[PDB]
Design an enzyme around this catalytic site. Structure first.
Site, PDB file in Angstrom:
ATOM      1  N   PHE A  26       2.970  10.587   2.473  1.00  0.00           N
ATOM      2  CA  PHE A  26       3.113  10.476   3.836  1.00  0.00           C
ATOM      3  C   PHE A  26       3.575   9.060   4.235  1.00  0.00           C
ATOM      4  CE2 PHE A  26      -0.450   8.716   6.288  1.00  0.00           C
ATOM      5  CZ  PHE A  26      -0.826   8.313   4.823  1.00  0.00           C
ATOM      6  N   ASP A  27       3.194   8.122   3.605  1.00  0.00           N
ATOM      7  CA  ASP A  27       3.507   6.670   4.057  1.00  0.00           C
ATOM      8  C   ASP A  27       3.949   5.720   3.235  1.00  0.00           C
ATOM      9  OD1 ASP A  27       3.837   4.059   4.633  1.00  0.00           O
ATOM     10  OD2 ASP A  27       1.903   4.155   5.775  1.00  0.00           O
ATOM     11  N   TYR A  32       1.167  -0.876   0.088  1.00  0.00           N
ATOM     12  CA  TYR A  32      -0.174   0.310   0.303  1.00  0.00           C
ATOM     13  C   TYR A  32       0.952   1.230   0.177  1.00  0.00           C
ATOM     14  CZ  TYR A  32       0.298   1.222   4.608  1.00  0.00           C
ATOM     15  OH  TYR A  32       1.404   1.629   5.985  1.00  0.00           O
ATOM     16  N   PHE A  58      -5.223   6.611  -0.279  1.00  0.00           N
ATOM     17  CA  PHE A  58      -4.487   5.175   0.030  1.00  0.00           C
ATOM     18  C   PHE A  58      -4.978   4.603  -1.661  1.00  0.00           C
ATOM     19  CE2 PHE A  58      -5.868   5.762   4.405  1.00  0.00           C
ATOM     20  CZ  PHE A  58      -4.319   5.798   4.462  1.00  0.00           C
ATOM     21  N   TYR A  98      -7.655   9.273  10.564  1.00  0.00           N
ATOM     22  CA  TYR A  98      -7.775   9.928  12.078  1.00  0.00           C
ATOM     23  C   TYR A  98      -8.405  10.787  13.026  1.00  0.00           C
ATOM     24  CZ  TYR A  98      -2.768   7.086  11.458  1.00  0.00           C
ATOM     25  OH  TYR A  98      -1.684   6.120  11.542  1.00  0.00           O
ATOM     26  N   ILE A 108      -6.491   0.823  10.963  1.00  0.00           N
ATOM     27  CA  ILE A 108      -7.496   2.112  11.373  1.00  0.00           C
ATOM     28  C   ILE A 108      -8.884   1.451   9.838  1.00  0.00           C
ATOM     29  CG2 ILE A 108      -6.126   4.126  11.342  1.00  0.00           C
ATOM     30  CD1 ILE A 108      -6.635   4.502   8.961  1.00  0.00           C
TER      31      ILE A 108
END
Lengths: 437, 313, 107
Positions: free
Chosen positions: C36-37, C26, C99, C82, C56
């Site tokens: 960010f990821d 992912y 995502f 979040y 989450i």
């Protein structure tokens, strides 16, 4: 006339069946003088990286002259600008390969013209204040019987190998590392006390050509007459009286993403709009988004956007009110051309203009300067030191992208194929949005 | 140390945020376009990820007067559809691009760009339209009423381990719809060479070649010599030499053997135009009696001086 | 309700059931496009159990409606994500997440 297979102009089609029409009046001319009636008839700069600016010793590189036109090859100080053209100041110390002269604050003849398929060669003393060129193995002479071409300079921060091209010219420069492709080093150079750029390096020296696309820059103290005066509602003044003041596209720095308005003050031909983060269209004109819908069958297909460069024309207080979406007011009149389409875009405040009068433009239901910064109660407006008044300037140089792609090309079906992924290291300034590696 | 990380970091707005992306190169088959035209591609390799990031492959057209093609380092991420001078398409999940803003068009498969696909793009001549299709199925083609300046040509871009085949002739599969294939804009003299989309590189270990900028469609400009009126002394003088010019249309046709007929049929020896210049009207000899007038005005009006000197006959 | 856009089709019928591990590769980004990821970056296929309240809820529910080989572009709601507290350092308060997830294996 439909399905016409000859739908091309004069420049390409078969004129040999038209040569019956050509030679019809080539022999009918013999019926005229037998009767007694006769007939009688841009400039790109190329340089190496500033960190290679050698300030000592005896150095040499060469240039191959391929085609006709601008061939200017020399050595310049690190402060030389590619916004201008070469030679026309004290910075550049270059030799004109064509027109047989040399450029340093002017013109004076030196040597001859090149030939097609040449190797020029240029040599520079840095300890001694002389600079002697060569050409095709032959040392180049002045009109005054001297091969010592450029003398009596000042040793500041060294001298970088520069060049210039014209309109349809092809160039070839060699900074060493290719001793097998040194075509005239064996007679001049090592036997004259000189050095190539092959003396130490293990890397490929990065070149800094000039950039075609104008992208804007800070407003310096560097113009004949351009001076934004920062004043405290809280406008930004001007003055632009010179001899050459055709068009300068002005813009502020910081954008608005997706409630407040924005006031100018002009006496007269002068546009007011909004720039999106890609505007490198230099033009002394008026020119240019427009994409439709798609609803799985068509059947509506109307539009998405209106913005792509927004248009307007005693006190002309034309005002770009924002949000929501975009509209325009003009001296109180909410005029036409509602540009009310922007999904999630960033918009720069902008003014495109000529210059007739000095002290001509200004800037700034409350006011504006809340909607940029992070504190947004901020109903008292306030100017800040980050607010700049950029001017779209022409040519700031680019890096050379030292390894590109390992593509191959075929024809039988035209297979084009690469298999070696390269990667950047890109950083983008967030508030003056543009991507630099 | 927690406090700087909660405030200064996550805005991504005060600092200089960074990334790395893949190099993008574009190629075009040296075609230009100053009815509706049609070119193809067959993508023969997939590579969804050969990096620590996604790979991209976009198809479409462009312009030529604007946006010098700078790879990645100029405008955002380089490539195809990233500027206003670029109108592009094509993705796994085929949502398109125009001016580095992605919009989300549909088709009831949502294919990849696999090894076994064909694009079907089109461009209208004398109309501002570009419509795509995947395997013939309509993607609801989109681009209407953008700029018409410069010349339009396909500048497919790629950053992967991907190979593609220009179906441009060596056609293998293409629908014909509308009327033009791009094998007809390469008709008279130009060849089929593919370049690196304005080529400021010549990746050689010794010396990259250098370049100058550029130097620059069936509606040309003719030459006009109507409003330079002949004097009536040289007007009869031209028709004296035209009296012995229409007989040259007999002189190259008395060898051809297509004799006189009151009907006009050249392919079975009927020809009503054997009588000379001033005797026949501007009806059937209009192709050889009005022909001599304006084509001889500019004989003495394009600088070629033939003054009133000797006897025309 | 989270926006699940399919990108590539997998096989559709073999879906992850409740009580299994999910091999996902992912890559996540903010609404602005800033990344960010990832999981291509650190080069480990992620793994987690459905229902144990580990990942989450937007990621979990969007990973529920996929299959093997299918990849998706989840556009998760910040209230399922979040939230207004966000995450101190990485995620700003109340920003939507994009995502690009891809399943590889299950249990």
């Amino acid at each position: 006339q439909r399905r016409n297979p000859r739908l091309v102009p004069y420049a390409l089609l078969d004129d040999r069946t038209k040569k019956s029409n050509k030679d019809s009046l080539r022999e009918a001319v013999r019926t005229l003088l037998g009767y007694g009636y006769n007939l009688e008839a841009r400039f790109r700069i190329f340089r190496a990286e500033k960190t290679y600016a050698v300030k000592a010793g005896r150095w040499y590189f060469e240039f191959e002259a391929v085609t006709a036109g601008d061939m200017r090859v020399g050595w310049s100080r690190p402060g030389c600008q590619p916004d201008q053209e070469l030679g026309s100041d004290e910075r550049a110390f270059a030799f004109d390969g064509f027109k047989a002269q040399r450029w340093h604050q002017g013109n004076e003849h030196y040597g001859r013209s090149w030939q097609a398929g040449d190797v020029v060669g240029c040599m520079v003393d840095m300890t001694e204040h002389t600079m002697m060129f060569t050409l095709n193995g032959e040392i180049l002479l002045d009109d005054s019987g001297s091969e010592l071409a450029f003398k009596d300079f000042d040793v500041g921060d060294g001298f970088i190998p520069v060049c210039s091209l014209g309109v349809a010219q092809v160039g070839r420069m060699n900074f060493g590392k290719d001793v097998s492709t040194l075509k005239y080093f064996t007679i001049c150079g090592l036997q004259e006390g000189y050095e190539p750029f092959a003396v130490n390096t293990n890397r490929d020296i990065t070149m800094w050509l000039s950039k075609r696309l104008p992208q804007f820059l800070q407003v310096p103290s560097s113009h004949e007459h351009i001076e934004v005066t920062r004043i405290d509602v809280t406008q930004k003044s001007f003055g632009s009286q010179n001899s050459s003041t055709d068009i300068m596209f002005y813009r502020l720095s910081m954008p608005i993403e997706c409630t407040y308005y924005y006031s100018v003050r002009i006496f007269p031909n002068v546009w007011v709009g909004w720039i999106t983060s890609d505007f490198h269209q230099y033009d002394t004109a008026f020119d240019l988004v427009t994409v439709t819908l798609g609803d799985e069958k068509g059947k509506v297909h109307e539009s998405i956007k209106r913005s792509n460069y927004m248009v307007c024309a005693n006190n002309g207080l034309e005002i770009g009110c924002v949000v929501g979406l975009l509209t325009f007011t003009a001296n109180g009149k909410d005029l036409s051309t509602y540009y009310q389409v922007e999904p999630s875009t960033k918009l720069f405040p902008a003014v495109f203009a000529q210059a007739t009068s000095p002290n001509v433009f200004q800037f700034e239901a409350g006011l504006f300067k809340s909607e940029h910064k992070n504190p947004v109660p901020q109903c008292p407006p306030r100017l800040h030191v980050q607010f700049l008044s950029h001017v779209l300037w022409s040519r700031m140089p680019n890096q050379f992208l030292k390894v590109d792609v390992s593509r191959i090309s075929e024809r039988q079906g035209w297979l084009v194929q690469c298999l070696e992924p390269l990667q950047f290291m890109s950083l983008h300034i967030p508030e003056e949005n543009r991507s630099v590696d | 140390q927690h406090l700087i990380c909660d405030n200064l970091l996550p805005g991504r707005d005060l600092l200089l945020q960074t990334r790395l992306v893949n190099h993008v190169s574009s190629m075009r088959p040296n075609i230009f376009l100053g009815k509706k035209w049609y070119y193809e591609l067959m993508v023969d390799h997939t590579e969804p990820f050969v990096t620590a990031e996604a790979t991209h492959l976009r198809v479409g057209w462009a312009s030529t007067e604007g946006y010098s093609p700078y790879p990645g380092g100029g405008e955002e991420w380089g490539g195809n559809g990233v500027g206003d001078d670029l109108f592009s398409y094509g993705f796994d999940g085929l949502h398109l691009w125009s001016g580095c803003i992605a919009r989300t068009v549909s088709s009831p498969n949502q294919h990849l760009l696999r090894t076994d696909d064909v694009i079907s793009c089109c461009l209208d001549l004398s109309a501002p339209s570009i419509s795509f299709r995947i395997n013939g199925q309509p993607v609801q083609g989109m681009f209407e009423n953008f700029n018409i300046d410069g010349l339009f040509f396909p500048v497919v871009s790629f950053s992967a381990g991907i190979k593609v085949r220009f179906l441009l002739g060596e056609f293998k599969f293409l629908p014909p719809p509308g009327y033009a294939p791009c094998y007809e804009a390469v008709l008279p003299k130009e060849k089929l060479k593919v370049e690196h989309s304005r080529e400021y590189k010549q990746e050689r270990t010794y010396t990259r070649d250098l370049l100058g900028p550029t130097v620059s469609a069936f509606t040309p400009i003719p030459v006009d010599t109507s409003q330079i009126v002949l004097p009536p002394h040289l007007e009869r003088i031209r028709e004296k030499l035209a009296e012995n010019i229409h007989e040259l249309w007999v002189m190259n046709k008395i060898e051809l053997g297509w004799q006189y007929g009151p009907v006009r049929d050249d392919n079975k020896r009927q020809h009503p135009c054997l009588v000379e210049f001033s005797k026949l009207p501007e009806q059937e000899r209009n192709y050889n009696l009005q022909m001599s007038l304006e084509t001889l005005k500019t004989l003495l009006a394009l600088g070629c001086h033939v003054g009133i000197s000797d006897e025309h006959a | 309700g989270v926006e699940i856009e399919t990108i590539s089709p997998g096989d559709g019928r073999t879906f992850p059931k409740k009580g299994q591990t999910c091999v996902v590769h992912y890559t996540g980004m903010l609404q602005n496009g800033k990344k960010f990821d990832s999981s291509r970056d650190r080069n480990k296929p992620f793994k987690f159990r459905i229902g144990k309240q580990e990942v989450i809820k937007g990621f979990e529910e969007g990973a529920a409606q996929m299959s093997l080989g299918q990849r998706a572009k989840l556009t998760c709601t910040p209230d399922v994500a979040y939230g207004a507290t966000g995450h101190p350092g990485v995620i700003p308060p109340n920003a939507t997440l994009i995502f690009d997830v891809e399943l590889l294996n299950l249990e």
